[PDB]
Design a protein around this ligand. Structure first.
Ligand SMILES: CC(=O)N[C@H]1[C@@H](O[C@@H]2[C@@H](O)[C@@H](CO)O[C@@H](O)[C@@H]2O[C@@H]2O[C@@H](C)[C@@H](O)[C@@H](O)[C@@H]2O)O[C@H](CO)[C@H](O)[C@@H]1O
Ligand SMILES: CC(=O)N[C@H]1[C@@H](O[C@H]2[C@@H](O)[C@@H](CO)O[C@@H](O)[C@@H]2O[C@@H]2O[C@@H](C)[C@@H](O)[C@@H](O)[C@@H]2O)O[C@H](CO)[C@H](O)[C@@H]1O
Lengths: 284, 284
């Protein structure tokens, strides 16, 4: 029926950058809902936001610099239009930080580091343009390399739970994700992101979970999916979790000892059955 | 019951580099066999060579440099040992060319690592490669672009693999893949690779196929699976293919100028049924 990848978490990838998943976590005290644009897929198999099927499209950009601006296109080279979304499919969605994209060219040698500040009004990927920060004329394909603290919210710290400013504060943003409540906490898959700090990138689903869900457009019954996080070596059930139709998991923490982050990351999520949205999970 | 990802080839990735698939093709006449180390998975879900589950490990290296050599570890940081294989999981497998990997660090603010896979200092199988000017420190690197081999006006031949050991030496490489004959030919998924030329990187299975077969762990009945490359738009069968146990596809080209090379990239492969190894395919 409905299925999730029968693969160990630590072997999967983040969905907002091509990084391996290192642990599971929760949002900080000051984050209730999130609105990531990448790593968004319904249990139905419907890609949301700028989420691509393949990790080979994640946190990447493509376009032509005329010396002052870079006109964006799909990674494909086919045109991008505002009505389609906040930015081209795959566009980085890491807010609260400056980006450093590695730029390459088909037909040309070498690479160039592209420093991106997502706060000026020259940064408008929704309208198909972003400031060329010294990147000279030519066609480029870039991938997020490493990040750093924001240049203009002067002195501010890296905050990856945020999303960048796509439009020039209606960019057709994917709806934001809200915790169901009543004891249930949203689970995030974390990864370490290169840069001058101990940066941790969260995402709602592992990228392979997305390609798998988009592949298995399973007629998802039930308002919520009861899953077991199991150790593939012992078959031991390490705790119950829930998967909602919008494409996110939750669980119930155990007060102090905590929950998700305590669990080892070599486990596998297994679909046990369709339950009601109001089903109660045993702690973890 | 065995399956293949119900996703368009054009939205999937190459398995030897994190690059989108741009087309399908055949090996040049001067290539009778292939021995790629990444992108190897049996229909059984058995990963071979240095093949990883996630694209987040593809064509990446990890190790500590002392300015002279780089002692490699798994992307993980966990140690590597000769007995484990030709190189750590995910180590770039592109022979016939020089590499240019983008090096980054956790905790520091990228460096281009120019790699000649030809010298004596290049022994990733012994977990050690020359630091071509790369300063001391720990780094995570990913292949960015390629260029002609430093040794011997040699051409860029992406159908070869690098010399992992110090030519002939048991580096525990994955076995070779041979065209079963019978008019059948090996099918490759190609991706355009950055560099000073029109480079096309071939692989035996998109990366999305690997994570899927490894997840399915489906018992390989029959000697080969009969496949139909279907157009999702019109639902029409665009040609018959066969998938074999070791993890490769084949087809009978209906002439030199006719083959998978001329089919549209947005089709989906669909398992129709298990047939005899000898089953003759209709030309494509
Ligand atoms: C390349 C880089 O690491 N940029 C970061 C860096 O800020 C840069 C950097 O060169 C540091 C080195 O000491 O000096 C800063 O002044 C510089 O700021 C950046 O460039 C200057 C000329 C102005 O354009 C600034 O607005 C811009 O941020 O660290 C920054 C935060 O301190 C930020 O992460 C940059 O991306
Ligand atoms: C950075 C780069 O583009 N490297 C490729 C390039 O290397 C050669 C050129 O950069 C050339 C430009 O005038 O300068 C040469 O010094 C350089 O040669 C490289 O280093 C020397 C010492 C030898 O070891 C060469 O084998 C080596 O390539 O072009 C070569 C091919 O000619 C390679 O693709 C380099 O990766």
């Amino acid at each position: 029926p409905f299925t999730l990848p029968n693969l160990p978490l630590s072997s999967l990838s983040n969905s907002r950058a091509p990084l391996p998943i290192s642990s599971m976590g929760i949002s900080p005290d000051n984050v209730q809902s999130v609105q990531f644009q990448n790593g968004r897929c319904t249990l139905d198999g419907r890609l949301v936001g700028t989420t691509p099927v393949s990790l080979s499209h994640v946190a990447k950009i493509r376009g032509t610099s005329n010396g002052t601006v870079i006109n964006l296109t799909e990674l494909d080279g086919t045109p991008f239009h505002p009505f389609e979304g906040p930015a081209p499919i795959g566009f980085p969605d890491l807010g609260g930080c400056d980006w450093h994209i590695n730029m390459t060219q088909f037909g040309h040698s070498s690479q160039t580091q592209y420093d991106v500040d997502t706060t000026p009004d020259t940064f408008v990927p929704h309208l198909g343009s972003i400031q060329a920060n010294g990147i000279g004329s030519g066609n480029y394909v870039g991938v997020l390399s490493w990040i750093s603290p924001p240049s203009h919210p002067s002195g501010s710290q890296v905050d990856l739970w945020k999303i960048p400013n796509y439009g020039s504060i209606a960019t057709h943003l994917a709806p934001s994700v809200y915790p169901p409540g009543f004891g249930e906490v949203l689970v995030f898959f974390m990864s370490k992101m290169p840069g001058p700090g101990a940066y941790n990138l969260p995402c709602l689903l592992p990228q392979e979970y997305i390609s798998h869900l988009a592949s298995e457009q399973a007629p998802t019954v039930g308002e919520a999916a009861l899953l077991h996080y199991v150790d593939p070596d012992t078959g031991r059930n390490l705790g119950e979790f829930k998967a909602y139709p919008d494409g996110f998991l939750t669980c119930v923490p155990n007060g102090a000892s905590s929950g998700p982050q305590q669990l080892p990351i070599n486990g596998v999520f297994v679909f046990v059955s369709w339950v009601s949205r109001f089903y109660q999970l045993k702690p973890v």
